[PDB]
């Protein structure tokens, strides 16, 4: 599968990230069992990435583009849209489905 987006709290419902814009987010990343492997909130610093530059996994590129500014959403990302068969040594195991709690704070 690809990326599923399930809303957590609504944004403005009007402003959606376009290619080339910088997305400012807080996020928590968990394995399918629920184990957290990464979180911007634990560092108390929002994460910024430029949409369309493949600075993040494909599930983020396509999933965050579906979110409106101010929305919080749950992205469930299959391995093909994620770290794939290889994964990430000691962080994300092979063929892992990932769950991301993502809040789109603003666009720059």
PDB file of N, CA and C in Angstrom:
ATOM      1  N   UNK A   1       0.826  -1.202   0.000  1.00  0.00           N
ATOM      2  CA  UNK A   1       0.000   0.000   0.000  1.00  0.00           C
ATOM      3  C   UNK A   1       0.865   1.260   0.000  1.00  0.00           C
ATOM      4  N   UNK A   2       0.230   2.426   0.035  1.00  0.00           N
ATOM      5  CA  UNK A   2       0.980   3.671  -0.008  1.00  0.00           C
ATOM      6  C   UNK A   2       1.071   4.366   1.335  1.00  0.00           C
ATOM      7  N   UNK A   3       0.397   5.507   1.461  1.00  0.00           N
ATOM      8  CA  UNK A   3       0.252   6.213   2.727  1.00  0.00           C
ATOM      9  C   UNK A   3      -1.234   6.454   2.952  1.00  0.00           C
ATOM     10  N   UNK A   4      -1.704   6.132   4.148  1.00  0.00           N
ATOM     11  CA  UNK A   4      -3.044   6.485   4.585  1.00  0.00           C
ATOM     12  C   UNK A   4      -2.951   7.670   5.534  1.00  0.00           C
ATOM     13  N   UNK A   5      -3.860   8.625   5.366  1.00  0.00           N
ATOM     14  CA  UNK A   5      -3.923   9.818   6.201  1.00  0.00           C
ATOM     15  C   UNK A   5      -5.225   9.765   6.990  1.00  0.00           C
ATOM     16  N   UNK A   6      -5.116   9.777   8.315  1.00  0.00           N
ATOM     17  CA  UNK A   6      -6.268   9.838   9.204  1.00  0.00           C
ATOM     18  C   UNK A   6      -6.137  11.080  10.071  1.00  0.00           C
ATOM     19  N   UNK A   7      -7.153  11.937  10.033  1.00  0.00           N
ATOM     20  CA  UNK A   7      -7.072  13.204  10.740  1.00  0.00           C
ATOM     21  C   UNK A   7      -7.050  12.972  12.244  1.00  0.00           C
ATOM     22  N   UNK A   8      -6.344  13.847  12.949  1.00  0.00           N
ATOM     23  CA  UNK A   8      -6.352  13.890  14.403  1.00  0.00           C
ATOM     24  C   UNK A   8      -7.048  15.151  14.911  1.00  0.00           C
ATOM     25  N   UNK A   9      -6.697  16.306  14.348  1.00  0.00           N
ATOM     26  CA  UNK A   9      -7.337  17.588  14.622  1.00  0.00           C
ATOM     27  C   UNK A   9      -7.314  18.389  13.330  1.00  0.00           C
ATOM     28  N   UNK A  10      -8.359  19.155  13.034  1.00  0.00           N
ATOM     29  CA  UNK A  10      -8.432  19.835  11.738  1.00  0.00           C
ATOM     30  C   UNK A  10      -7.534  21.063  11.660  1.00  0.00           C
ATOM     31  N   UNK A  11      -7.026  21.302  10.452  1.00  0.00           N
ATOM     32  CA  UNK A  11      -6.318  22.523  10.127  1.00  0.00           C
ATOM     33  C   UNK A  11      -7.275  23.560   9.583  1.00  0.00           C
ATOM     34  N   UNK A  12      -6.747  24.459   8.748  1.00  0.00           N
ATOM     35  CA  UNK A  12      -7.640  25.458   8.164  1.00  0.00           C
ATOM     36  C   UNK A  12      -8.477  24.896   7.022  1.00  0.00           C
ATOM     37  N   UNK A  13      -8.157  23.693   6.546  1.00  0.00           N
ATOM     38  CA  UNK A  13      -8.874  23.066   5.454  1.00  0.00           C
ATOM     39  C   UNK A  13      -8.732  23.758   4.120  1.00  0.00           C
ATOM     40  N   UNK A  14      -7.784  24.688   3.985  1.00  0.00           N
ATOM     41  CA  UNK A  14      -7.715  25.507   2.784  1.00  0.00           C
ATOM     42  C   UNK A  14      -6.301  25.611   2.219  1.00  0.00           C
ATOM     43  N   UNK A  15      -5.285  25.599   3.082  1.00  0.00           N
ATOM     44  CA  UNK A  15      -3.901  25.846   2.680  1.00  0.00           C
ATOM     45  C   UNK A  15      -3.131  24.527   2.697  1.00  0.00           C
ATOM     46  N   UNK A  16      -2.765  24.039   1.514  1.00  0.00           N
ATOM     47  CA  UNK A  16      -2.087  22.760   1.387  1.00  0.00           C
ATOM     48  C   UNK A  16      -0.681  22.954   0.833  1.00  0.00           C
ATOM     49  N   UNK A  17       0.311  22.227   1.350  1.00  0.00           N
ATOM     50  CA  UNK A  17       1.689  22.412   0.874  1.00  0.00           C
ATOM     51  C   UNK A  17       1.812  22.148  -0.620  1.00  0.00           C
ATOM     52  N   UNK A  18       2.491  23.059  -1.305  1.00  0.00           N
ATOM     53  CA  UNK A  18       2.810  22.918  -2.713  1.00  0.00           C
ATOM     54  C   UNK A  18       4.295  22.622  -2.865  1.00  0.00           C
ATOM     55  N   UNK A  19       4.651  22.044  -4.012  1.00  0.00           N
ATOM     56  CA  UNK A  19       6.035  21.668  -4.266  1.00  0.00           C
ATOM     57  C   UNK A  19       6.940  22.891  -4.184  1.00  0.00           C
ATOM     58  N   UNK A  20       8.063  22.738  -3.484  1.00  0.00           N
ATOM     59  CA  UNK A  20       8.994  23.821  -3.266  1.00  0.00           C
ATOM     60  C   UNK A  20       8.834  24.562  -1.953  1.00  0.00           C
ATOM     61  N   UNK A  21       7.687  24.435  -1.288  1.00  0.00           N
ATOM     62  CA  UNK A  21       7.483  25.090  -0.006  1.00  0.00           C
ATOM     63  C   UNK A  21       8.154  24.311   1.120  1.00  0.00           C
ATOM     64  N   UNK A  22       8.530  25.031   2.170  1.00  0.00           N
ATOM     65  CA  UNK A  22       9.128  24.408   3.342  1.00  0.00           C
ATOM     66  C   UNK A  22       8.029  24.096   4.350  1.00  0.00           C
ATOM     67  N   UNK A  23       7.941  22.831   4.751  1.00  0.00           N
ATOM     68  CA  UNK A  23       6.951  22.366   5.714  1.00  0.00           C
ATOM     69  C   UNK A  23       7.589  22.345   7.095  1.00  0.00           C
ATOM     70  N   UNK A  24       6.995  23.067   8.040  1.00  0.00           N
ATOM     71  CA  UNK A  24       7.474  23.103   9.419  1.00  0.00           C
ATOM     72  C   UNK A  24       6.539  22.228  10.239  1.00  0.00           C
ATOM     73  N   UNK A  25       7.070  21.129  10.785  1.00  0.00           N
ATOM     74  CA  UNK A  25       6.250  20.133  11.462  1.00  0.00           C
ATOM     75  C   UNK A  25       6.852  19.757  12.808  1.00  0.00           C
ATOM     76  N   UNK A  26       5.980  19.341  13.716  1.00  0.00           N
ATOM     77  CA  UNK A  26       6.350  18.442  14.791  1.00  0.00           C
ATOM     78  C   UNK A  26       5.838  17.056  14.436  1.00  0.00           C
ATOM     79  N   UNK A  27       6.583  16.032  14.845  1.00  0.00           N
ATOM     80  CA  UNK A  27       6.209  14.673  14.485  1.00  0.00           C
ATOM     81  C   UNK A  27       6.707  13.699  15.537  1.00  0.00           C
ATOM     82  N   UNK A  28       6.048  12.545  15.576  1.00  0.00           N
ATOM     83  CA  UNK A  28       6.508  11.373  16.304  1.00  0.00           C
ATOM     84  C   UNK A  28       6.414  10.189  15.356  1.00  0.00           C
ATOM     85  N   UNK A  29       7.489   9.414  15.252  1.00  0.00           N
ATOM     86  CA  UNK A  29       7.524   8.235  14.406  1.00  0.00           C
ATOM     87  C   UNK A  29       7.565   6.971  15.252  1.00  0.00           C
ATOM     88  N   UNK A  30       6.670   6.042  14.937  1.00  0.00           N
ATOM     89  CA  UNK A  30       6.571   4.788  15.665  1.00  0.00           C
ATOM     90  C   UNK A  30       6.564   3.619  14.690  1.00  0.00           C
ATOM     91  N   UNK A  31       7.091   2.487  15.150  1.00  0.00           N
ATOM     92  CA  UNK A  31       6.955   1.236  14.425  1.00  0.00           C
ATOM     93  C   UNK A  31       5.499   0.778  14.488  1.00  0.00           C
ATOM     94  N   UNK A  32       5.179  -0.305  13.774  1.00  0.00           N
ATOM     95  CA  UNK A  32       3.792  -0.767  13.780  1.00  0.00           C
ATOM     96  C   UNK A  32       3.374  -1.273  15.157  1.00  0.00           C
ATOM     97  N   UNK A  33       4.312  -1.817  15.938  1.00  0.00           N
ATOM     98  CA  UNK A  33       3.987  -2.266  17.289  1.00  0.00           C
ATOM     99  C   UNK A  33       3.764  -1.112  18.260  1.00  0.00           C
ATOM    100  N   UNK A  34       4.061   0.120  17.855  1.00  0.00           N
ATOM    101  CA  UNK A  34       3.908   1.280  18.711  1.00  0.00           C
ATOM    102  C   UNK A  34       5.197   1.869  19.247  1.00  0.00           C
ATOM    103  N   UNK A  35       6.333   1.189  19.081  1.00  0.00           N
ATOM    104  CA  UNK A  35       7.595   1.694  19.609  1.00  0.00           C
ATOM    105  C   UNK A  35       8.012   2.969  18.890  1.00  0.00           C
ATOM    106  N   UNK A  36       8.249   4.026  19.661  1.00  0.00           N
ATOM    107  CA  UNK A  36       8.724   5.280  19.100  1.00  0.00           C
ATOM    108  C   UNK A  36      10.202   5.167  18.749  1.00  0.00           C
ATOM    109  N   UNK A  37      10.550   5.514  17.510  1.00  0.00           N
ATOM    110  CA  UNK A  37      11.944   5.531  17.098  1.00  0.00           C
ATOM    111  C   UNK A  37      12.468   6.926  16.796  1.00  0.00           C
ATOM    112  N   UNK A  38      11.595   7.920  16.635  1.00  0.00           N
ATOM    113  CA  UNK A  38      12.039   9.278  16.347  1.00  0.00           C
ATOM    114  C   UNK A  38      10.923  10.247  16.710  1.00  0.00           C
ATOM    115  N   UNK A  39      11.314  11.427  17.185  1.00  0.00           N
ATOM    116  CA  UNK A  39      10.332  12.438  17.576  1.00  0.00           C
ATOM    117  C   UNK A  39      11.000  13.803  17.583  1.00  0.00           C
ATOM    118  N   UNK A  40      10.440  14.747  16.823  1.00  0.00           N
ATOM    119  CA  UNK A  40      10.895  16.129  16.921  1.00  0.00           C
ATOM    120  C   UNK A  40      10.484  16.759  18.247  1.00  0.00           C
ATOM    121  N   UNK A  41       9.352  16.323  18.809  1.00  0.00           N
ATOM    122  CA  UNK A  41       8.853  16.904  20.053  1.00  0.00           C
ATOM    123  C   UNK A  41       9.807  16.649  21.207  1.00  0.00           C
ATOM    124  N   UNK A  42      10.424  15.466  21.243  1.00  0.00           N
ATOM    125  CA  UNK A  42      11.371  15.163  22.308  1.00  0.00           C
ATOM    126  C   UNK A  42      12.616  16.039  22.228  1.00  0.00           C
ATOM    127  N   UNK A  43      12.937  16.564  21.047  1.00  0.00           N
ATOM    128  CA  UNK A  43      14.025  17.522  20.905  1.00  0.00           C
ATOM    129  C   UNK A  43      13.569  18.970  21.070  1.00  0.00           C
ATOM    130  N   UNK A  44      12.259  19.202  21.206  1.00  0.00           N
ATOM    131  CA  UNK A  44      11.661  20.543  21.280  1.00  0.00           C
ATOM    132  C   UNK A  44      12.155  21.439  20.147  1.00  0.00           C
ATOM    133  N   UNK A  45      12.257  20.876  18.955  1.00  0.00           N
ATOM    134  CA  UNK A  45      12.584  21.698  17.800  1.00  0.00           C
ATOM    135  C   UNK A  45      11.794  21.175  16.612  1.00  0.00           C
ATOM    136  N   UNK A  46      10.969  22.011  15.985  1.00  0.00           N
ATOM    137  CA  UNK A  46      10.220  21.565  14.807  1.00  0.00           C
ATOM    138  C   UNK A  46      11.159  21.128  13.697  1.00  0.00           C
ATOM    139  N   UNK A  47      10.667  20.217  12.869  1.00  0.00           N
ATOM    140  CA  UNK A  47      11.428  19.697  11.744  1.00  0.00           C
ATOM    141  C   UNK A  47      10.974  20.390  10.467  1.00  0.00           C
ATOM    142  N   UNK A  48      11.934  20.843   9.668  1.00  0.00           N
ATOM    143  CA  UNK A  48      11.652  21.522   8.412  1.00  0.00           C
ATOM    144  C   UNK A  48      12.166  20.703   7.236  1.00  0.00           C
ATOM    145  N   UNK A  49      11.351  20.612   6.188  1.00  0.00           N
ATOM    146  CA  UNK A  49      11.780  19.973   4.954  1.00  0.00           C
ATOM    147  C   UNK A  49      11.081  20.658   3.794  1.00  0.00           C
ATOM    148  N   UNK A  50      11.707  20.597   2.622  1.00  0.00           N
ATOM    149  CA  UNK A  50      11.179  21.242   1.428  1.00  0.00           C
ATOM    150  C   UNK A  50      10.445  20.203   0.592  1.00  0.00           C
ATOM    151  N   UNK A  51       9.161  20.454   0.338  1.00  0.00           N
ATOM    152  CA  UNK A  51       8.336  19.484  -0.370  1.00  0.00           C
ATOM    153  C   UNK A  51       8.841  19.293  -1.795  1.00  0.00           C
ATOM    154  N   UNK A  52       8.935  18.034  -2.218  1.00  0.00           N
ATOM    155  CA  UNK A  52       9.379  17.698  -3.553  1.00  0.00           C
ATOM    156  C   UNK A  52      10.869  17.471  -3.718  1.00  0.00           C
ATOM    157  N   UNK A  53      11.674  17.676  -2.673  1.00  0.00           N
ATOM    158  CA  UNK A  53      13.116  17.475  -2.758  1.00  0.00           C
ATOM    159  C   UNK A  53      13.565  16.106  -2.263  1.00  0.00           C
ATOM    160  N   UNK A  54      12.632  15.246  -1.853  1.00  0.00           N
ATOM    161  CA  UNK A  54      12.955  13.895  -1.387  1.00  0.00           C
ATOM    162  C   UNK A  54      13.933  13.932  -0.210  1.00  0.00           C
ATOM    163  N   UNK A  55      13.775  14.945   0.647  1.00  0.00           N
ATOM    164  CA  UNK A  55      14.479  15.017   1.920  1.00  0.00           C
ATOM    165  C   UNK A  55      13.844  14.127   2.979  1.00  0.00           C
ATOM    166  N   UNK A  56      12.635  13.624   2.718  1.00  0.00           N
ATOM    167  CA  UNK A  56      11.895  12.744   3.614  1.00  0.00           C
ATOM    168  C   UNK A  56      11.390  11.556   2.800  1.00  0.00           C
ATOM    169  N   UNK A  57      10.870  10.542   3.504  1.00  0.00           N
ATOM    170  CA  UNK A  57      10.355   9.353   2.817  1.00  0.00           C
ATOM    171  C   UNK A  57       9.188   9.737   1.917  1.00  0.00           C
ATOM    172  N   UNK A  58       8.924   8.873   0.931  1.00  0.00           N
ATOM    173  CA  UNK A  58       7.860   9.143  -0.028  1.00  0.00           C
ATOM    174  C   UNK A  58       6.511   9.308   0.663  1.00  0.00           C
ATOM    175  N   UNK A  59       6.245   8.502   1.694  1.00  0.00           N
ATOM    176  CA  UNK A  59       4.988   8.631   2.414  1.00  0.00           C
ATOM    177  C   UNK A  59       4.796  10.003   3.028  1.00  0.00           C
ATOM    178  N   UNK A  60       5.889  10.642   3.453  1.00  0.00           N
ATOM    179  CA  UNK A  60       5.803  12.022   3.919  1.00  0.00           C
ATOM    180  C   UNK A  60       5.542  12.983   2.764  1.00  0.00           C
ATOM    181  N   UNK A  61       6.249  12.806   1.643  1.00  0.00           N
ATOM    182  CA  UNK A  61       6.070  13.699   0.500  1.00  0.00           C
ATOM    183  C   UNK A  61       4.617  13.722   0.045  1.00  0.00           C
ATOM    184  N   UNK A  62       4.006  12.549  -0.078  1.00  0.00           N
ATOM    185  CA  UNK A  62       2.633  12.453  -0.543  1.00  0.00           C
ATOM    186  C   UNK A  62       1.624  12.651   0.579  1.00  0.00           C
ATOM    187  N   UNK A  63       1.977  12.270   1.809  1.00  0.00           N
ATOM    188  CA  UNK A  63       1.029  12.380   2.910  1.00  0.00           C
ATOM    189  C   UNK A  63       0.881  13.799   3.435  1.00  0.00           C
ATOM    190  N   UNK A  64       2.003  14.487   3.653  1.00  0.00           N
ATOM    191  CA  UNK A  64       1.960  15.843   4.193  1.00  0.00           C
ATOM    192  C   UNK A  64       1.324  16.802   3.190  1.00  0.00           C
ATOM    193  N   UNK A  65       1.509  16.551   1.890  1.00  0.00           N
ATOM    194  CA  UNK A  65       0.871  17.371   0.867  1.00  0.00           C
ATOM    195  C   UNK A  65      -0.652  17.320   0.948  1.00  0.00           C
ATOM    196  N   UNK A  66      -1.210  16.304   1.596  1.00  0.00           N
ATOM    197  CA  UNK A  66      -2.651  16.188   1.763  1.00  0.00           C
ATOM    198  C   UNK A  66      -3.162  16.904   3.004  1.00  0.00           C
ATOM    199  N   UNK A  67      -2.278  17.477   3.808  1.00  0.00           N
ATOM    200  CA  UNK A  67      -2.663  18.105   5.064  1.00  0.00           C
ATOM    201  C   UNK A  67      -2.795  19.607   4.880  1.00  0.00           C
ATOM    202  N   UNK A  68      -3.734  20.207   5.597  1.00  0.00           N
ATOM    203  CA  UNK A  68      -3.852  21.656   5.603  1.00  0.00           C
ATOM    204  C   UNK A  68      -3.069  22.229   6.780  1.00  0.00           C
ATOM    205  N   UNK A  69      -2.669  23.498   6.650  1.00  0.00           N
ATOM    206  CA  UNK A  69      -1.888  24.151   7.697  1.00  0.00           C
ATOM    207  C   UNK A  69      -2.664  24.127   9.004  1.00  0.00           C
ATOM    208  N   UNK A  70      -1.993  23.702  10.072  1.00  0.00           N
ATOM    209  CA  UNK A  70      -2.598  23.585  11.384  1.00  0.00           C
ATOM    210  C   UNK A  70      -3.187  22.227  11.684  1.00  0.00           C
ATOM    211  N   UNK A  71      -3.253  21.339  10.696  1.00  0.00           N
ATOM    212  CA  UNK A  71      -3.804  20.012  10.907  1.00  0.00           C
ATOM    213  C   UNK A  71      -2.792  19.119  11.608  1.00  0.00           C
ATOM    214  N   UNK A  72      -3.299  18.240  12.462  1.00  0.00           N
ATOM    215  CA  UNK A  72      -2.547  17.113  12.987  1.00  0.00           C
ATOM    216  C   UNK A  72      -3.148  15.851  12.388  1.00  0.00           C
ATOM    217  N   UNK A  73      -2.296  14.927  11.948  1.00  0.00           N
ATOM    218  CA  UNK A  73      -2.799  13.747  11.258  1.00  0.00           C
ATOM    219  C   UNK A  73      -1.891  12.553  11.517  1.00  0.00           C
ATOM    220  N   UNK A  74      -2.475  11.370  11.378  1.00  0.00           N
ATOM    221  CA  UNK A  74      -1.764  10.108  11.510  1.00  0.00           C
ATOM    222  C   UNK A  74      -1.482   9.562  10.116  1.00  0.00           C
ATOM    223  N   UNK A  75      -0.202   9.454   9.771  1.00  0.00           N
ATOM    224  CA  UNK A  75       0.226   8.871   8.508  1.00  0.00           C
ATOM    225  C   UNK A  75       0.666   7.439   8.770  1.00  0.00           C
ATOM    226  N   UNK A  76       0.001   6.484   8.125  1.00  0.00           N
ATOM    227  CA  UNK A  76       0.422   5.088   8.150  1.00  0.00           C
ATOM    228  C   UNK A  76       1.049   4.772   6.801  1.00  0.00           C
ATOM    229  N   UNK A  77       2.320   4.378   6.822  1.00  0.00           N
ATOM    230  CA  UNK A  77       3.164   4.335   5.635  1.00  0.00           C
ATOM    231  C   UNK A  77       3.686   2.914   5.459  1.00  0.00           C
ATOM    232  N   UNK A  78       3.388   2.311   4.308  1.00  0.00           N
ATOM    233  CA  UNK A  78       3.879   0.976   3.993  1.00  0.00           C
ATOM    234  C   UNK A  78       5.363   1.030   3.621  1.00  0.00           C
ATOM    235  N   UNK A  79       6.069  -0.107   3.712  1.00  0.00           N
ATOM    236  CA  UNK A  79       7.531  -0.072   3.511  1.00  0.00           C
ATOM    237  C   UNK A  79       7.975   0.476   2.162  1.00  0.00           C
ATOM    238  N   UNK A  80       7.218   0.238   1.086  1.00  0.00           N
ATOM    239  CA  UNK A  80       7.627   0.767  -0.214  1.00  0.00           C
ATOM    240  C   UNK A  80       7.681   2.289  -0.205  1.00  0.00           C
ATOM    241  N   UNK A  81       6.857   2.922   0.632  1.00  0.00           N
ATOM    242  CA  UNK A  81       6.790   4.368   0.791  1.00  0.00           C
ATOM    243  C   UNK A  81       7.643   4.861   1.953  1.00  0.00           C
ATOM    244  N   UNK A  82       8.541   4.013   2.439  1.00  0.00           N
ATOM    245  CA  UNK A  82       9.213   4.116   3.726  1.00  0.00           C
ATOM    246  C   UNK A  82      10.613   3.582   3.501  1.00  0.00           C
ATOM    247  N   UNK A  83      11.163   2.874   4.476  1.00  0.00           N
ATOM    248  CA  UNK A  83      12.521   2.360   4.404  1.00  0.00           C
ATOM    249  C   UNK A  83      12.640   0.990   3.718  1.00  0.00           C
ATOM    250  N   UNK A  84      11.562   0.474   3.127  1.00  0.00           N
ATOM    251  CA  UNK A  84      11.608  -0.700   2.251  1.00  0.00           C
ATOM    252  C   UNK A  84      12.098  -2.000   2.894  1.00  0.00           C
ATOM    253  N   UNK A  85      12.604  -2.888   2.027  1.00  0.00           N
ATOM    254  CA  UNK A  85      13.116  -4.180   2.479  1.00  0.00           C
ATOM    255  C   UNK A  85      14.348  -4.016   3.360  1.00  0.00           C
ATOM    256  N   UNK A  86      15.206  -3.048   3.032  1.00  0.00           N
ATOM    257  CA  UNK A  86      16.425  -2.793   3.793  1.00  0.00           C
ATOM    258  C   UNK A  86      16.140  -2.193   5.163  1.00  0.00           C
ATOM    259  N   UNK A  87      15.272  -1.184   5.217  1.00  0.00           N
ATOM    260  CA  UNK A  87      15.078  -0.453   6.465  1.00  0.00           C
ATOM    261  C   UNK A  87      16.279   0.415   6.848  1.00  0.00           C
ATOM    262  N   UNK A  88      16.445   0.565   8.167  1.00  0.00           N
ATOM    263  CA  UNK A  88      17.526   1.352   8.750  1.00  0.00           C
ATOM    264  C   UNK A  88      18.135   0.583   9.910  1.00  0.00           C
ATOM    265  N   UNK A  89      19.396   0.161   9.805  1.00  0.00           N
ATOM    266  CA  UNK A  89      20.076  -0.609  10.862  1.00  0.00           C
ATOM    267  C   UNK A  89      19.843  -0.132  12.280  1.00  0.00           C
ATOM    268  N   UNK A  90      19.268  -1.006  13.100  1.00  0.00           N
ATOM    269  CA  UNK A  90      19.100  -0.709  14.505  1.00  0.00           C
ATOM    270  C   UNK A  90      18.093   0.369  14.824  1.00  0.00           C
ATOM    271  N   UNK A  91      17.304   0.817  13.849  1.00  0.00           N
ATOM    272  CA  UNK A  91      16.257   1.799  14.107  1.00  0.00           C
ATOM    273  C   UNK A  91      14.940   1.291  13.543  1.00  0.00           C
ATOM    274  N   UNK A  92      14.943   0.914  12.275  1.00  0.00           N
ATOM    275  CA  UNK A  92      13.731   0.495  11.586  1.00  0.00           C
ATOM    276  C   UNK A  92      14.001  -0.859  10.947  1.00  0.00           C
ATOM    277  N   UNK A  93      13.240  -1.897  11.280  1.00  0.00           N
ATOM    278  CA  UNK A  93      13.554  -3.256  10.807  1.00  0.00           C
ATOM    279  C   UNK A  93      13.069  -3.465   9.382  1.00  0.00           C
ATOM    280  N   UNK A  94      13.481  -4.546   8.713  1.00  0.00           N
ATOM    281  CA  UNK A  94      13.067  -4.737   7.318  1.00  0.00           C
ATOM    282  C   UNK A  94      11.555  -4.767   7.152  1.00  0.00           C
ATOM    283  N   UNK A  95      11.092  -4.251   6.007  1.00  0.00           N
ATOM    284  CA  UNK A  95       9.684  -4.347   5.602  1.00  0.00           C
ATOM    285  C   UNK A  95       8.751  -3.786   6.675  1.00  0.00           C
ATOM    286  N   UNK A  96       9.094  -2.619   7.207  1.00  0.00           N
ATOM    287  CA  UNK A  96       8.376  -2.061   8.342  1.00  0.00           C
ATOM    288  C   UNK A  96       7.302  -1.083   7.885  1.00  0.00           C
ATOM    289  N   UNK A  97       6.088  -1.260   8.403  1.00  0.00           N
ATOM    290  CA  UNK A  97       5.044  -0.254   8.272  1.00  0.00           C
ATOM    291  C   UNK A  97       5.183   0.740   9.417  1.00  0.00           C
ATOM    292  N   UNK A  98       5.264   2.024   9.081  1.00  0.00           N
ATOM    293  CA  UNK A  98       5.509   3.071  10.061  1.00  0.00           C
ATOM    294  C   UNK A  98       4.257   3.907  10.286  1.00  0.00           C
ATOM    295  N   UNK A  99       4.112   4.408  11.508  1.00  0.00           N
ATOM    296  CA  UNK A  99       3.015   5.295  11.877  1.00  0.00           C
ATOM    297  C   UNK A  99       3.613   6.611  12.354  1.00  0.00           C
ATOM    298  N   UNK A 100       3.204   7.716  11.731  1.00  0.00           N
ATOM    299  CA  UNK A 100       3.696   9.042  12.081  1.00  0.00           C
ATOM    300  C   UNK A 100       2.542   9.918  12.554  1.00  0.00           C
ATOM    301  N   UNK A 101       2.698  10.500  13.740  1.00  0.00           N
ATOM    302  CA  UNK A 101       1.825  11.564  14.228  1.00  0.00           C
ATOM    303  C   UNK A 101       2.457  12.889  13.809  1.00  0.00           C
ATOM    304  N   UNK A 102       1.805  13.610  12.898  1.00  0.00           N
ATOM    305  CA  UNK A 102       2.395  14.777  12.245  1.00  0.00           C
ATOM    306  C   UNK A 102       1.461  15.968  12.395  1.00  0.00           C
ATOM    307  N   UNK A 103       2.011  17.100  12.833  1.00  0.00           N
ATOM    308  CA  UNK A 103       1.286  18.362  12.917  1.00  0.00           C
ATOM    309  C   UNK A 103       1.967  19.374  12.007  1.00  0.00           C
ATOM    310  N   UNK A 104       1.223  19.910  11.036  1.00  0.00           N
ATOM    311  CA  UNK A 104       1.760  20.896  10.096  1.00  0.00           C
ATOM    312  C   UNK A 104       1.599  22.279  10.711  1.00  0.00           C
ATOM    313  N   UNK A 105       2.695  22.806  11.263  1.00  0.00           N
ATOM    314  CA  UNK A 105       2.649  24.070  11.995  1.00  0.00           C
ATOM    315  C   UNK A 105       2.475  25.263  11.064  1.00  0.00           C
ATOM    316  N   UNK A 106       3.223  25.297   9.964  1.00  0.00           N
ATOM    317  CA  UNK A 106       3.200  26.425   9.040  1.00  0.00           C
ATOM    318  C   UNK A 106       4.015  26.064   7.808  1.00  0.00           C
ATOM    319  N   UNK A 107       3.861  26.879   6.767  1.00  0.00           N
ATOM    320  CA  UNK A 107       4.637  26.762   5.540  1.00  0.00           C
ATOM    321  C   UNK A 107       5.545  27.975   5.395  1.00  0.00           C
ATOM    322  N   UNK A 108       6.766  27.740   4.926  1.00  0.00           N
ATOM    323  CA  UNK A 108       7.717  28.827   4.687  1.00  0.00           C
ATOM    324  C   UNK A 108       8.182  28.833   3.236  1.00  0.00           C
TER     325      UNK A 108
END
